């Protein structure tokens, strides 16, 4: 068994973490267990604290706007490890007890209970080279030695490790995605009828996505092209929450549909990161540091939870758009569009033990 360790620049206090990936179950989040190793000789009268904070970054690292920091703290938890606080009566995890047994008597445990229904670790892709710091939600465990919390702490006396709060695909598949849209232009005849569906709701990263398109064009308007695209929606929730949109994959076929006819076809799409390196603000999965990441997994939320959850909430949809040729007595190059949306889930399969 191996555990992660990090030491302060002065090398006096070091903190031990069993793992750096914490699974976010909908009902509860896995506890953040760890042990900090200190020494009474260095700390004459100070008390060491461990703080777990959730940092959300609004914009670029440089302020350049009245000198204010675009960095919100969505959740901050604090605990006094040494001396052992008689206030908290939390038990000891088996990993924590093993760490205490392995380390000396100068090792003290800390545990964090992350409340449920919080944003996961998501980082926004900066696209072209503009900034040196990432932008997004992340979690970090910091342990520092100080006299009291309301005090500036030197960077030489504090450790800090980024941790990931991740979610995995649900063990059971859901209802098959399906969308329908009927449209008539000038009440000529029976309306155009578009039907689209996906083979399954939950897809994993790198798997192809099969879109079953079925069109019965009963009107007199010919369909020029059919465009299938996968779009990533990032609910960047804040004061006056907004919506970010980005086409991750696309396929614009030239399959025409004649009036009073039908056309059924299956289009296979695959969202991957090779062709999406130039899209600024694309939600990534948010690893520890600059490393191999992928498209951010769809955020799972409780159906009976609060809607105004700050951070980034990632979701994916498949848009099937038919561009119909427009023109009657006067022949122009204008066109109309009939589109449907098929929401699906993009996650990682649960690791097998």
């Amino acid at each position: 068994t191996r555990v992660f360790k990090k030491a302060s620049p002065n090398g006096k206090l070091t903190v031990y973490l069993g793992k750096r990936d914490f699974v976010d179950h909908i009902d509860l989040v896995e506890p953040v267990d760890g042990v900090v190793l200190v020494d009474p000789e260095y700390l004459k009268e100070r008390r060491v604290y461990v703080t777990l904070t959730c940092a959300f970054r609004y914009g670029r690292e440089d302020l350049d706007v009245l000198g204010l920091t675009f960095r919100k703290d969505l959740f901050v938890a604090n605990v006094q490890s040494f001396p052992p606080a008689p206030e908290d009566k939390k038990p000891l995890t088996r990993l924590q007890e093993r760490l205490i047994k392995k380390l000396g008597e100068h090792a003290y445990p800390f545990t964090f209970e992350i409340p449920p229904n919080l944003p996961c670790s998501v980082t926004l892709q900066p696209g072209p080279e503009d900034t040196g710091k990432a932008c997004g939600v992340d979690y970090e465990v910091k342990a520092f030695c100080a006299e009291n919390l309301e005090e500036k702490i030197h960077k030489r006396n504090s450790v800090r490790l980024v941790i990931e709060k991740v979610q995995y695909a649900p063990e059971r598949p859901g209802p098959q995605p399906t969308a329908e849209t009927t449209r008539q232009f000038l009440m000529s005849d029976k309306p155009l009828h578009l039907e689209a569906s996906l083979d399954k709701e939950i897809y994993y990263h790198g798997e192809p996505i099969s879109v079953n398109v079925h069109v019965t064009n009963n009107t007199n308007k010919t369909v020029k092209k059919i465009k299938i695209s996968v779009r990533q929606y990032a609910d960047i929730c804040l004061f006056n929450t907004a919506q970010y949109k980005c086409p991750v994959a696309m396929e614009e076929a030239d399959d025409t549909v004649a009036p009073s006819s039908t056309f059924c076809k299956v289009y296979t799409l695959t969202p991957f990161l090779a062709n999406n390196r130039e899209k600024r603000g694309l939600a990534l999965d948010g690893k520890l540091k600059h490393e191999d990441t992928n498209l951010a997994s769809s955020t799972l939320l409780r159906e009976g939870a609060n809607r105004e959850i700050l951070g980034i909430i990632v979701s994916y949809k498949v848009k099937v758009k038919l561009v119909v040729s427009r023109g009657g007595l006067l022949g122009d190059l204008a066109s109309s569009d009939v589109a449907v949306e098929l929401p699906f889930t993009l996650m990682h399969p649960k690791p097998k033990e």
């Epitope: 990263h205 798997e207 992928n294």
Partner: antibody
Framework: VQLVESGGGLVQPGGSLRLSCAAS????????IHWVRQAPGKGLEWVAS????????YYADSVKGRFTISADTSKNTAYLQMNSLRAEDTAVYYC?????????????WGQGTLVTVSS | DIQMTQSPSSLSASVGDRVTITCRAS??????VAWYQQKPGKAPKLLIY???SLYSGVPSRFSGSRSGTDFTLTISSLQPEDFATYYC?????????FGQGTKVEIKR
Amino acid sequence: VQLVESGGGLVQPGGSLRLSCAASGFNVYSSSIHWVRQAPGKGLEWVASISSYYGYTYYADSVKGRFTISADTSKNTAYLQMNSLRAEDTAVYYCARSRQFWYSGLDYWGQGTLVTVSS
Amino acid sequence: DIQMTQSPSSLSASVGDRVTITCRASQSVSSAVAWYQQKPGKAPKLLIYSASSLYSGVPSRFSGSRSGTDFTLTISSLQPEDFATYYCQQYKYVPVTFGQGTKVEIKR
């Protein structure tokens, strides 16, 4: 679930050859493709690798500039163009598959095709 | 570049005996060590990954472990079908480097 290799044979020093590795049952984006060669009476040596999810491409220090690996995602096949085939390239080339996300070893390996570059 | 020292280069055991194969890494790889088995005239077959996790379909008699930069593959009860060449790879950094290869033969 299967990897099939083809395109190996007798080559002359300085010639060119192209190996094809057709992947059946795997997705080229959810899995990375690796090429490992085994010299006659020797051990395994990694040659090249391609990651279609990221577009990354790696080669061994002894094959850089000469060997080129690519992938045709439509047919789920990977190609390895080998230019300036030196005499030390006599080996059996295996095409292997590993999970693109959270690499966990070479799960599937092909039967391998012998490439002889004798003059 | 990391060079893995697989020892011994060749050993002779019998059916039912316990066999240990050692693999030492030059640099420090965390757990990215995999063990493969190759029979003469056949492609290699993955046996263990992450230096401790057993691959699906591999008999339970194979077992891996790590002690610092010293990895070990252990066969509790050698079988007549478990006599082949075993390699030791390290996929922590690119390039991925394999071991020299340990060849297991029957003892007489």
